[PDB]
């Protein structure tokens, strides 16, 4: 598994401790590391009290499949991590939402998958755990102490979310035309009306690459060449103190704009570091997140940069005659 970006796994004591909303980007990254975002999501939506990711952190979150290309890169953000950063919103599951089969759902308290419309997360209540189907919450003494390890969290798909450059409607409609020409045998994906079909089969699991350029629905492709580029923008750097924890808003803004905070060489050319003396324990220091950059997809002729590029499991209704 990949490492923590900033902070190690949390050691929680009081299950009713309030979760604050710290403005710093590095502080948000540290919260993401400790699975504070999933705990806050469960509190807000599923009437859950306590914390997940106890003593394990984000490193050992379960994935489906276990072998995930983007999991080994720590800096790559999952849909939940993107939710905590304000990029997207993970909705609470409704009755119509579909739970994909295949993952081991026994004991899980939270699991999210990227649907054809948006992102849906399922959560179980306090003192309860999902059953093997993933459709039910049942009583469990294991999830009773109020502190749960990271093996209770499941993330579905090989997802990677990132800053998005907006694209106009004409490009999106061309991409949709390419997708519908490339997938003529699909009629519904997660209940969202795909190309017209007079005959619907039973829903089936479907593993397919997709992008979230950002519109009414996602774009799924079969052939594509994805390139990775490093821009070393301000989003690629996380600034932290010596050993205590992430820096605050003021220190982060000072180091990232004034350019008087020492760090590594990449940050030195990107922004500018402090040199000369070395006793700068109070001063923050900034490094680059362990990600291969941002994905640029070359699909359907003209190439776009998506918001989220992934390889997940969805539900499809194939055409019958």
């Amino acid at each position, epitope marked *: *598994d*990949s*490492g*923590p*970006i*900033i*902070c*190690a*796994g*949390p*050691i929680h004591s009081n299950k009713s401790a309030d979760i604050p909303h710290l403005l710093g980007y590095s502080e948000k990254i*540290c919260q993401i*590391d400790r699975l504070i975002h999933v705990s806050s999501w469960l509190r807000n939506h599923s009437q859950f009290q306590g914390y997940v990711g106890q*003593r394990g952190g984000r490193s050992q979150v379960s994935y489906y499949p276990a072998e995930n290309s983007y999991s*080994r*890169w*720590s800096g790559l953000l999952s849909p939940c991590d993107a939710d905590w950063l304000g990029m997207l919103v993970v909705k609470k599951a409704k009755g119509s939402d579909m739970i994909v089969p295949g993952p081991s759902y026994k004991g899980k308290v939270f699991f999210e998958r990227p649907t054809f419309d948006g992102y849906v997360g399922w959560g179980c209540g306090s003192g309860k755990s999902r059953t093997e189907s993933g459709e039910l919450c049942s009583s469990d003494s294991g999830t009773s102490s109020g502190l749960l390890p990271s093996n209770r969290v499941l993330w579905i798909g090989d997802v990677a979310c990132q800053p998005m450059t907006p694209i106009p409607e004409e490009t999106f409609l061309e991409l949709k035309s390419f997708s519908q020409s490339e997938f003529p045998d699909i009629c519904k994906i997660d209940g969202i009306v795909f190309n017209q079909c007079e005959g619907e089969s039973l829903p089936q699991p479907f593993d397919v690459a997709w992008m979230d350029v950002g519109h009414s629905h996602k774009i799924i492709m079969r052939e594509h060449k994805t390139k990775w580029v490093q821009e070393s923008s301000s989003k690629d750097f996380v600034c*932290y*103190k*010596e*050993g*205590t*924890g*992430p820096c605050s808003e003021s220190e982060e803004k000072t180091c990232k704009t004034s350019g008087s905070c020492r*760090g*590594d*060489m*990449q940050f030195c050319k990107v922004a500018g570091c402090e040199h000369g003396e*070395e*006793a700068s*324990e109070a001063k923050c*220091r900034c*490094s*680059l997140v*362990h990600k291969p950059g941002e994905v640029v997809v070359s699909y359907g002729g003209m190439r776009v940069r998506p918001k989220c590029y992934g390889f997940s499991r969805m539900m499809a209704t194939l055409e019958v005659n």
Partner: nanobody
Amino acid sequence: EVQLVESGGGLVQAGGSLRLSCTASGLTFSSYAMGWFRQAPGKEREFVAAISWSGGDTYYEDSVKGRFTISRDNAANTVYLQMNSLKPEDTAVYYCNSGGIATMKLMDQYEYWGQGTQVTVSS
């Protein structure tokens, strides 16, 4: 099943120089940020040095900043720690661990420890 067994100890004299190594297996080396810790006789553990995944960012304890140099080699999954201008107060068992780049000084989240290398300096 993380198994990080280290080596590099001895009985170097005052002002000597020794290099310690710590091979990490069963865990992704290139993503974790490794750190070195010490244990003076009859005392708890103290943070000594740390290094980021890329090897560009390091911090030390103030008393040992003047000499130590920690560098990593991702090829053979080892993390190093140069020991320059040793002093008799440096006698301690050095333990190599991992986890987090910022949350490193606080020694509370550290499950499990390596066998450790006993480094003693004689006046």
